[PDB]
Amino acid sequence: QPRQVNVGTVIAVGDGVARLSGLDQVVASEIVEFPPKAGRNESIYGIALNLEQDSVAAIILGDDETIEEGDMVTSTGRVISVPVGQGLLGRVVNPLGQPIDGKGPIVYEKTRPIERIAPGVITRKSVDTPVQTGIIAIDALIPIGRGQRELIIGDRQTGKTAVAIDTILNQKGQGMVCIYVAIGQRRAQVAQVVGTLERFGAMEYTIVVSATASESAALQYIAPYAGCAMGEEIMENGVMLNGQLVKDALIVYDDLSKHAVAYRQVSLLLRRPPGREAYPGDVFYLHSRLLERAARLNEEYGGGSLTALPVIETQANDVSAYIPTNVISITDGQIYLESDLFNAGQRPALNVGISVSRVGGAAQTRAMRAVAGKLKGELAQFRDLAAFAQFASDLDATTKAQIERGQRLQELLKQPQYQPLPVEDQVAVLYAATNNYLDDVPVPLITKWRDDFLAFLRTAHPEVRKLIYDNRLDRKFPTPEVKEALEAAIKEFKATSN
Amino acid sequence: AQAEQERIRMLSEAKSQIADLVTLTASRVLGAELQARGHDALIAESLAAL
Amino acid sequence: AKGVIQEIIGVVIRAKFPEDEVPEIYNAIEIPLGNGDRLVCEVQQQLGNGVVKAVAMGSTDGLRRGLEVIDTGRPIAVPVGPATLGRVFNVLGDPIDGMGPIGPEVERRPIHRDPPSFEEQNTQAQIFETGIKVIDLIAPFTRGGKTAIFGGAGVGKTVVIQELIANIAKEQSGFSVFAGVGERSREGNDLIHEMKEARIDENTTVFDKTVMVFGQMNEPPGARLRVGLTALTMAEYFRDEGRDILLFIDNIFRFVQAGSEVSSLLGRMPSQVGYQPTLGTEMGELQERITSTKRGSITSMQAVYVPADDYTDPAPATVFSHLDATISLERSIAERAIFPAVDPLASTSRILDPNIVGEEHYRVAQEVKRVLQRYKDLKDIIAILGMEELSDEDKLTVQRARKIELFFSQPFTVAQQFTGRPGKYVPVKKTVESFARLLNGEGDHIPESFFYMQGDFDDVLAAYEA
Amino acid sequence: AKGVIQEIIGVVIRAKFPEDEVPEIYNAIEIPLGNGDRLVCEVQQQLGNGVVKAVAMGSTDGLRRGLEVIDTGRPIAVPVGPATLGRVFNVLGDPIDGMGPIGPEVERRPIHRDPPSFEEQNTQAQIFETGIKVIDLIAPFTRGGKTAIFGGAGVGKTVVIQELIANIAKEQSGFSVFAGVGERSREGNDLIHEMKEARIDENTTVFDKTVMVFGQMNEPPGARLRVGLTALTMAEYFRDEGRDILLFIDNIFRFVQAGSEVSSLLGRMPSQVGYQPTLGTEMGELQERITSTKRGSITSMQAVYVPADDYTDPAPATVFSHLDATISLERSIAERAIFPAVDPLASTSRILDPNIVGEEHYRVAQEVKRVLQRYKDLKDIIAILGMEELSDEDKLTVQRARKIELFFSQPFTVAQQFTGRPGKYVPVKKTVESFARLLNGEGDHIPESFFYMQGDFDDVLAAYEASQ
Amino acid sequence: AVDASVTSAIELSAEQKERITRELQQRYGDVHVTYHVDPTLIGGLIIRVGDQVLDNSLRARLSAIQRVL
Numbered sequence A: 001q002p003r004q005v006n007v008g009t010v011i012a013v014g015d016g017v018a019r020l021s022g023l024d025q026v027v028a029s030e031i032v033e034f035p036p037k038a039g040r041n042e043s044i045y046g047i048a049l050n051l052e053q054d055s056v057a058a059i060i061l062g063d064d065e066t067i068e069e070g071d072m073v074t075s076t077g078r079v080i081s082v083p084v085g086q087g088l089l090g091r092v093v094n095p096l097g098q099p100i101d102g103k104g105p106i107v108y109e110k111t112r113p114i115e116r117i118a119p120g121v122i123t124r125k126s127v128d129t130p131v132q133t134g135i136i137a138i139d140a141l142i143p144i145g146r147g148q149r150e151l152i153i154g155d156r157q158t159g160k161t162a163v164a165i166d167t168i169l170n171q172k173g174q175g176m177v178c179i180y181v182a183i184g185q186r187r188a189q190v191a192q193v194v195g196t197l198e199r200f201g202a203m204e205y206t207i208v209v210s211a212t213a214s215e216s217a218a219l220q221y222i223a224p225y226a227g228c229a230m231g232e233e234i235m236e237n238g239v240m241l242n243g244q245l246v247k248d249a250l251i252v253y254d255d256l257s258k259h260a261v262a263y264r265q266v267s268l269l270l271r272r273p274p275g276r277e278a279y280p281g282d283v284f285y286l287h288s289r290l291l292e293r294a295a296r297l298n299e300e301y302g303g304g305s306l307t308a309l310p311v312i313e314t315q316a317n318d319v320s321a322y323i324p325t326n327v328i329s330i331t332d333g334q335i336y337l338e339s340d341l342f343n344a345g346q347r348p349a350l351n352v353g354i355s356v357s358r359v360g361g362a363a364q365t366r367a368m369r370a371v372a373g374k375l376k377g378e379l380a381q382f383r384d385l386a387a388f389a390q391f392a393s394d395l396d397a398t399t400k401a402q403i404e405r406g407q408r409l410q411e412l413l414k415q416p417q418y419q420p421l422p423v424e425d426q427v428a429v430l431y432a433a434t435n436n437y438l439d440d441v442p443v444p445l446i447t448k449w450r451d452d453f454l455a456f457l458r459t460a461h462p463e464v465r466k467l468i469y470d471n472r473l474d475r476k477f478p479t480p481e482v483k484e485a486l487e488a489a490i491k492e493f494k495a496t497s498n
Numbered sequence B: 001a002q003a004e005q006e007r008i009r010m011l012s013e014a015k016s017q018i019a020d021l022v023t024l025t026a027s028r029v030l031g032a033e034l035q036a037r038g039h040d041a042l043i044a045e046s047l048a049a050l
Numbered sequence C: 001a002k003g004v005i006q007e008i009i010g011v012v013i014r015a016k017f018p019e020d021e022v023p024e025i026y027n028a029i030e031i032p033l034g035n036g037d038r039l040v041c042e043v044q045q046q047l048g049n050g051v052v053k054a055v056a057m058g059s060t061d062g063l064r065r066g067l068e069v070i071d072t073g074r075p076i077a078v079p080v081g082p083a084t085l086g087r088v089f090n091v092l093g094d095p096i097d098g099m100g101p102i103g104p105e106v107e108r109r110p111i112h113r114d115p116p117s118f119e120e121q122n123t124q125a126q127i128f129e130t131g132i133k134v135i136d137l138i139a140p141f142t143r144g145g146k147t148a149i150f151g152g153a154g155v156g157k158t159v160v161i162q163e164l165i166a167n168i169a170k171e172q173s174g175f176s177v178f179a180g181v182g183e184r185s186r187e188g189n190d191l192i193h194e195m196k197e198a199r200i201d202e203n204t205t206v207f208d209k210t211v212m213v214f215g216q217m218n219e220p221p222g223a224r225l226r227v228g229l230t231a232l233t234m235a236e237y238f239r240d241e242g243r244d245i246l247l248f249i250d251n252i253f254r255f256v257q258a259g260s261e262v263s264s265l266l267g268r269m270p271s272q273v274g275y276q277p278t279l280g281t282e283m284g285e286l287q288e289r290i291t292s293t294k295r296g297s298i299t300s301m302q303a304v305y306v307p308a309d310d311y312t313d314p315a316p317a318t319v320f321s322h323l324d325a326t327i328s329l330e331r332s333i334a335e336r337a338i339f340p341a342v343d344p345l346a347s348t349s350r351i352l353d354p355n356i357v358g359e360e361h362y363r364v365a366q367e368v369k370r371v372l373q374r375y376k377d378l379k380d381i382i383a384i385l386g387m388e389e390l391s392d393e394d395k396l397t398v399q400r401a402r403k404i405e406l407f408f409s410q411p412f413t414v415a416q417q418f419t420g421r422p423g424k425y426v427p428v429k430k431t432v433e434s435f436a437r438l439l440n441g442e443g444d445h446i447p448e449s450f451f452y453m454q455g456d457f458d459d460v461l462a463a464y465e466a
Numbered sequence D: 001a002k003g004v005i006q007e008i009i010g011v012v013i014r015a016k017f018p019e020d021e022v023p024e025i026y027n028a029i030e031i032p033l034g035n036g037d038r039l040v041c042e043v044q045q046q047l048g049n050g051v052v053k054a055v056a057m058g059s060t061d062g063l064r065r066g067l068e069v070i071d072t073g074r075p076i077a078v079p080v081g082p083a084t085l086g087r088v089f090n091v092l093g094d095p096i097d098g099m100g101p102i103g104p105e106v107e108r109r110p111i112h113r114d115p116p117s118f119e120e121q122n123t124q125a126q127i128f129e130t131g132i133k134v135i136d137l138i139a140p141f142t143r144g145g146k147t148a149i150f151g152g153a154g155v156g157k158t159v160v161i162q163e164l165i166a167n168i169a170k171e172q173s174g175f176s177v178f179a180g181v182g183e184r185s186r187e188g189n190d191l192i193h194e195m196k197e198a199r200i201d202e203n204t205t206v207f208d209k210t211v212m213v214f215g216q217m218n219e220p221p222g223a224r225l226r227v228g229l230t231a232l233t234m235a236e237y238f239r240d241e242g243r244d245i246l247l248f249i250d251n252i253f254r255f256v257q258a259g260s261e262v263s264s265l266l267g268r269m270p271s272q273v274g275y276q277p278t279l280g281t282e283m284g285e286l287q288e289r290i291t292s293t294k295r296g297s298i299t300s301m302q303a304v305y306v307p308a309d310d311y312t313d314p315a316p317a318t319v320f321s322h323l324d325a326t327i328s329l330e331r332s333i334a335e336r337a338i339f340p341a342v343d344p345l346a347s348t349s350r351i352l353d354p355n356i357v358g359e360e361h362y363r364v365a366q367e368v369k370r371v372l373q374r375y376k377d378l379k380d381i382i383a384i385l386g387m388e389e390l391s392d393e394d395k396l397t398v399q400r401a402r403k404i405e406l407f408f409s410q411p412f413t414v415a416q417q418f419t420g421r422p423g424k425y426v427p428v429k430k431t432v433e434s435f436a437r438l439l440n441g442e443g444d445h446i447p448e449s450f451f452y453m454q455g456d457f458d459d460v461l462a463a464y465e466a467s468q
Numbered sequence E: 001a002v003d004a005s006v007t008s009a010i011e012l013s014a015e016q017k018e019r020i021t022r023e024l025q026q027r028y029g030d031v032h033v034t035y036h037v038d039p040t041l042i043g044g045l046i047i048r049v050g051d052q053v054l055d056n057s058l059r060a061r062l063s064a065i066q067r068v069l
């Protein structure tokens, strides 16, 4: 079936950007082929971004060192698209979807296109179901709901990737298909992430879409939109996980600052006019395109959801930079991680004083909503009372009482790595803390008290854990059946231990 | 579960291997087919066909 | 009136027309796609010989370098009438709700209009009945005047605007236009539609009495830039009919950001810290059509997201240049569950003078501010000294100030999701009466937490006696 | 082949070639230059009409327009093999030591090779003992993992690298490769030759097991821009055949700076602070080849220069994500004569995890960071008001923090000229024991002056006892 | 319309080359043909004129491998 295909000649190839001369009737985001020639047995695709007059400057998805001036290019009518479906679960792929873990070809039957309009206006629904991160601070004070965009913003090394990976790990039996998109991340670091996920068996519901540092800026540019397409298909059609049809997806953009840097590179190489901090004009548009596709569809449109967890690193905690402010404005919440808190022992290192979750209580179980209000208020009061704790010695036991209780709660939030706590665990611990059952415990021993109380709760009384978990959704969580046999367990642990 | 997943991965590897080898041997077949009886106007007919 | 596309660089399209049929500066371009759907692009610059540079207002992922372009002759025309009431539109005036399209019989008007002349300005200024105690008392809300909710995140700006729409639609008979400038789809679409389809009149819904124009954040910068003018046209229709109208603009900060993006993409030289050269005039074109004409008045309530606490940032600065009243939201107040988290101090208004609101309103509103400024200097003393009682009468002043601070909170009907409390509306006369009675001494002999979420002082007394 | 020079912009030479014989993107074109010696330029961009833009990688300040350019047709190929051991090379792979040239039979490999695939990455990691207290405790090095020392100008990056080489380059169990890019030709090399030929592992010097490529600062931008890749090509051959490689690259920042200068001459639009738009891509192309794969391991140990004391500069900012262990050298600490100068709070490591480095090591390091943090928080309080307004426990933690700061100081064998004290090799176990004892309360009575330039805690106790 | 190109595995078609040159005048007029060998190409159907091409000799095989895989 021979057919005419429009072609053009490469007239200038530079730092991953090729000028293609005559490619009339080419669409503004096509895939241009660069068919194989002598010395190159494969085809190097490219995205035709700049449709200028008598010249089409196309970025190259691969190494351009094999592309030579005068080479031929065929304008494939297809837009950029990736393979999507059930077969990707547990596979590391590049943004084009070609597997890179060397475990065999990706089995698929549908190829959703990346760069899709957002799901809709009236097609969404209010975020209600929680995303149990497994971290007490996030799950209690900055909750994340299914279909919410929650930014994880911090310094160069504070625990952003650790927080995201713990979130991914905690979705073991929660009917979530996590997606980890690595953008500009070094290959061995993505290997470390994949090893961590495989060690905890979290790679049976996870898709890794990696565009590492050496890979061309074009591949990193489409790195989050791929993977976002996979999450879109998971929320719209669903994939079979543990024998249950899961229509909830969680997508983690390892570093959107690196994505913005890649887009800046490909824009400056295309000679597009710069903007603030030398970024192109439509970088907010880029990130809003990416992050508005994460939604919680209503029952008419399937009822699925796609939760996004963008990650951004700030230079010297400069939140007011261009990309950090763009994505702070875009997202429905922020998780600020600070190095000062990280070194001070606050191991999650969240800055609760400024971190915000605009979904708020709606993204929590009714038990968490009923238990965490007192926590949030007491922590806010303690944060207001800062200097007095640390060297004012002339305080009554009214200021000092709040100082003590706030220190109790802050030590309670100190959590190790790779040890997520299910919802009933956090409910029980926060119930113990906020009902004055923990007051007599000294400050440094509270982490051990929490760990020991959990061990006692796994072993001594699993029935109370089951009882908490069964009725965590009722409007009035502290039911007398639950208040009894939970306060009783707390008293038993208090008397038996110490 | 992982044993079955690796079994189907091995099946996919074998299917890719045999599918690729079919073409890699068809390369020899078609090359030799065009080598001896390569005097066919069909090619030129296809060039003029458009 | 047909040309061709020359260049497509991102969301900026360069199209060549015949020499004598060049589109005007802000004309629509309307690139036609296959299935009858189209791509309306707004011209921005006439350059060269028949070449026009236009902003996409759409994807531009499906276009070639030879597609015909259908100049419309006029600017982006938007439906206006009774038929645009109770619907949801995008920047181009096309409905984005599930209902059917707007019929041709509905009048269309150009998005770009001149503001009222200096003669038409109505200098008579009178308070606009809000319903929220802290807004009605500390920062009274002008009729036909601009007000801005300032604050960072989790401060309550969008929810406060939502409450304003619901209250003024229910208790008053007031229409409203909502301009979702750079609108989050989660927030704007299915939390505004849902909680205004729940706020209900008698056989009528608040959603049915309001217009909503959502230029969402996923749309290109041009759509976010001109959605404000779309909403202004919608409101200006009703203003011309004589009805008092209440326009709402969500995060005019995002309007400024969209303007900056458009200017950067258009090749204009950057101004100040990379922002557009035409910043003040772009804001003026929008903010000067909102004014009190003799026939009618568009009253506006804008939300402004201040990054960190930077009021020197261009968007808050330009808004402040264009404001009448200022409402400042603080995260510290909100985290203490005083959810209408207005800061009494640092929340100003030019209406708060004895002549306009009244002598009693001015007196009772200036007392609270003083009382509270005293507490800001004594909250902290009672913290350090460990001694609440070491105060001759400042212990009474502190108690009264704490009662007042707890009293500013108010259960919102649109916040029934968050707290599950019915929404209480408090007229301004009731607000001044309640705070005057509290300052008189009736507020004493009632412990704290009875002023927490109550409408009137009468509601506080009823809660106390029960 | 047989092109002509069109333009000469700095070290960026524009050359026109026949339409059907244009060089590829990274081919090496040569100007004859007369006198029997040639100038090897590396192509960077293929312009229109067989026009290409090439980076001179040489003096290029005596050559005219219209000069003949010869296209070699292959990228810059450099020798690899055991023949490169104990030799010193240019960016071009031409030896610059007195010994003879590398014979044709030695394999030549291109310097522009694809990095190892994801499947080839080696995740295995274990502590690499260095003998330096602050490095071994706060940011333990990984065997086969990338680490870099960040610091300004006066702080001790090069002295740290030299002590590190003197410590670990004797028990190599393999070869090593050194790459002082844009470094001083005084200390960067010809003073490291002296110590690498003075050290004798076993009948063979450390130099005899070392490949060495310089491209020192004196060189023009192209040499500094491609010397890193030349050194990586030298090291990759030994990695691929299973030999464990120690890789020392100096001031990766001069690699980035040479890239910036070349990009400015190339007509690219500057990104951020005058830097090249292709900063991240060049950085990744260099650094993804620095990886320990399944076949063999490379224990890279880089140095990075931060413009002045700026740590938010784009070059170190891009470096930070390309590492397993980060070390930050502060000007303020060095000015206090705490010369190892590593900031414990700004220094981290991936293998500072109780499963890998040990539970006691992890506990001690985390406590030594918590205590260090407390002091940084109370720094201003101490600065203006004074030490007496702090609580008793805050006062104790401040004094312990100052003792810890003084205790990270360590004399080095290579730094014996500055501090007269002899060098001290402190094993990681002794470091952990010493800091655990210091935190436990032992040594509280000792004045802080006795923790300065000592080995393990036993040396501090001995000094105090000798002082009575 | 101009700057034609016809590449095939077996070059030296003699008169056929001239026949191609004279028969490529079907669209518009004169063309400048250039011939290549490209040994990896098993069969020759590539003809380019202006900004269009036609080839289904390696590409019928390419469609086959896309089908099977």
Ligand SMILES: Nc1ncnc2c1ncn2[C@@H]1O[C@H](COP(=O)(O)OP(=O)(O)OP(=O)(O)O)[C@@H](O)[C@H]1O
Pocket: A155, A156, A157, A158, A159, A160, A161, A162, A163, A313, A347, A348, A415, A416, A417, D321, D348, D349, D350, D352, D353
């Ligand atoms: N409870 C904890 N939470 C997070 N990180 C922890 C915790 N305990 C120890 N760490 C260590 O802190 C560091 C956290 O950095 P992580 O690898 O998560 O990436 P990051 O801080 O986002 O930065 P980057 O990926 O840019 O280096 C890691 O060394 C992790 O081992």
Ligand SMILES: Nc1ncnc2c1ncn2[C@@H]1O[C@H](COP(=O)(O)OP(=O)(O)O)[C@@H](O)[C@H]1O
Pocket: A357, A358, A359, A360, A361, C152, C153, C154, C155, C156, C157, C158, C159, C160, C187, C339, C340, C412, C415, C418, C419
């Ligand atoms: N009565 C209330 N009024 C306002 N905000 C409230 C109220 N109750 C709770 N909130 C909090 O405000 C959040 C909404 O913040 P919103 O005003 O939409 O955005 P912004 O942070 O821009 O002000 C809710 O999700 C909840 O966390």
Ligand SMILES: Nc1ncnc2c1ncn2[C@@H]1O[C@H](COP(=O)(O)OP(=O)(O)O)[C@@H](O)[C@H]1O
Pocket: D151, D152, D153, D154, D155, D156, D157, D158, D159, D160, D339, D340, D410, D411, D412, D415, D418, D419
């Ligand atoms: N262990 C040490 N003892 C004493 N001085 C040191 C030590 N390490 C570094 N220095 C000081 O650092 C200076 C050299 O720093 P150097 O390593 O050259 O940094 P850079 O390479 O960034 O210039 C010397 O003058 C020396 O005084």
Ligand SMILES: [Mg+2]
Pocket: A160, A161, A254
């Ligand atoms: Mg990370």
Ligand SMILES: [Mg+2]
Pocket: C157, C158, C187, C250
């Ligand atoms: Mg809002």
